[PDB]
Design an enzyme around this catalytic site. Sequence first.
Site, PDB file in Angstrom:
ATOM      1  N   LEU A 199       0.828  -1.194   0.000  1.00  0.00           N
ATOM      2  CA  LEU A 199       0.000   0.000   0.000  1.00  0.00           C
ATOM      3  C   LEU A 199       0.867   1.251   0.000  1.00  0.00           C
ATOM      4  O   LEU A 199       1.956   1.278   0.580  1.00  0.00           O
ATOM      5  CB  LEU A 199      -0.938   0.024   1.210  1.00  0.00           C
ATOM      6  CG  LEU A 199      -1.979  -1.092   1.272  1.00  0.00           C
ATOM      7  CD1 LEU A 199      -2.761  -1.019   2.572  1.00  0.00           C
ATOM      8  CD2 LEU A 199      -2.911  -1.017   0.077  1.00  0.00           C
ATOM      9  N   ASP A 200       0.365   2.288  -0.663  1.00  0.00           N
ATOM     10  CA  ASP A 200       1.043   3.571  -0.723  1.00  0.00           C
ATOM     11  C   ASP A 200       0.959   4.236   0.655  1.00  0.00           C
ATOM     12  O   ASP A 200       0.114   3.888   1.484  1.00  0.00           O
ATOM     13  CB  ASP A 200       0.426   4.403  -1.866  1.00  0.00           C
ATOM     14  CG  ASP A 200       0.787   5.889  -1.832  1.00  0.00           C
ATOM     15  OD1 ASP A 200       0.334   6.631  -0.936  1.00  0.00           O
ATOM     16  OD2 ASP A 200       1.543   6.321  -2.728  1.00  0.00           O
ATOM     17  N   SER A 201       1.880   5.175   0.903  1.00  0.00           N
ATOM     18  CA  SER A 201       1.968   5.831   2.208  1.00  0.00           C
ATOM     19  C   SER A 201       0.691   6.595   2.548  1.00  0.00           C
ATOM     20  O   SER A 201       0.267   6.621   3.710  1.00  0.00           O
ATOM     21  CB  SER A 201       3.173   6.770   2.235  1.00  0.00           C
ATOM     22  OG  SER A 201       4.267   6.221   1.521  1.00  0.00           O
TER      23      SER A 201
END
Lengths: 42, 156, 114, 110, 98, 82
Positions: free
Chosen positions: F38-40
């Site tokens: 997952l992206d930040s």
Amino acid sequence: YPTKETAHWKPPPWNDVDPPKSNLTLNFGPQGVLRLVMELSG
Amino acid sequence: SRGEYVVAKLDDLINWARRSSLWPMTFGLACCAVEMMHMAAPRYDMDRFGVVFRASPRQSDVMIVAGTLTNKMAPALRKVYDQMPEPRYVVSMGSCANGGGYYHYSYSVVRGCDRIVPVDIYVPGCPPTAEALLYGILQLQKKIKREKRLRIWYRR
Amino acid sequence: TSVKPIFSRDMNEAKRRVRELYRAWYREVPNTVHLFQLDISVKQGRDKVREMFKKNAHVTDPRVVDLLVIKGKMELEETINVWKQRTHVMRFFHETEAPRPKDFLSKFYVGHDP
Amino acid sequence: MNLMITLLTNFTLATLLVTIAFWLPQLNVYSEKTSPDPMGSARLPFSMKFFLVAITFLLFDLEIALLLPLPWASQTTNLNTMLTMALLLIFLLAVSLAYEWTQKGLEWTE
Amino acid sequence: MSLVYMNIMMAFTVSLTGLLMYRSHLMSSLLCLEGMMLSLFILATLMILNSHFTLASMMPIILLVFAACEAALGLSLLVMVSNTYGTDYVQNLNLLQC
Amino acid sequence: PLTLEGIKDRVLYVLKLYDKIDPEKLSVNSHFMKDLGLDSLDQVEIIMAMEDEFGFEIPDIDAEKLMCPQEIVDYIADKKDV
Ligand code: SF4
């Protein structure tokens, strides 16, 4: 004589003072021409 | 027949009534608004034509766009035009509201107020003289004078 | 090569400010949607916010991303109050724009633009 | 019954005028206004001075109704008692006005 | 007696049954109080004007003025609630039970 | 927020209320960066979903390292009484 119904009645504050639990802002339209963002207290 | 003559008489009656009491909404943007105010002077005197001075934009019949219509003002002008009740007419003062004029190639100037609202009468000048706008108002009155609403309604 | 910083001394502080700005924008998006009686959903607006945030993500200079944080904070503050109209909010969604050709064949058909 | 006849005629003429102003221009086929004030989203502030001056108006009008029947009373036999009562009542109005002056009533809405 | 008398009694009982079993805020209670005001005023005026008691024409006007000032007092009380809880609802009046 | 089982159950419930996460690949010790991929910013809105459903201010200096649900429940449990 606590029962189920009255089990949530907190004791009253000792000074018997309830805790206290702003100002108007106006957006005057441009209807020279000027758009004023106006802050009022009455 | 009876019907066409009757609706023609009623059409010219309501047409005179509409054209004799044109209440304007002046947009005080720029130089051409000062020229409008000097057309409101006692010398030229719009008020003898049935044209009141500085009416509210909720009851006005015509709107005169006098000045430069920039990008920051076009939604406000469109909102004002949408608020004004039917029938509504637009008269363009100056080269700014005609085609931008001096500021046609500027980055934040709408090239003509025709891109925002429908425009009926174009009045040329920078600024157009007070009697030129008076002639334009009389031209708008003559444009109203030849309207055929009731005849078209009966023919349709 | 030594320069004067703006607000962030290094990349980590700029990343933290990016995080805080994104948090504030994510808080505001439902209220912005409701206030302007917008036609979009909440998730579409949050997707647009993410798409801008990831479009502007290939720069590593701390001063550049600091200036972008400041500009995004001005955008957030302008959306906090009723200063923009519906038009300025809806400008981010290029809806009336016709979709330009992207592949080489359609670009060859429509004109000389590379 | 003539007074009620005049009232009914006047009210029906007003009804005719509002019917002309409300339903007669509906024959035209102009447009439908979708239409998507300085009050953005804040609640209406409770400016207390307006309520205070309204209830002050109420009290003054009530004792004005008390003060009313002097033209009918002026033919009474006991004129001295009437004069004392009327002077003392207007003095009571002056005293109430003075109190409303003193206790910060006529400030910030003078 | 006369039928208008009984109509005024039925009106007063209507105002009574409206004043007690409310669901809204205090303005409804004060409006029903003004209903009681009006019913008592009309009944007293009809009684005084029917029996030719000339002096007791002091009764109706006074029967307003005093309680009218009292009614003004009630308005101030509502303003106090409007300065404390934001809304003058009666369901917010549950602080004195405990 | 009474026992650790109930609070981690509601954490899991609001975690699979998120729709870009895969419940089949989801575990109790998975990582938001590498295991979940997952992206930040997705982790940021996970933190803010915790913030909204629980109701306090999760600061910015300690949300940088909260990359697993075990550390999530550890951080809200030591900051509370439990
Ligand atoms: S057309 Fe000329 S005179 Fe009129 S507003 Fe523009 S610059 Fe001024």
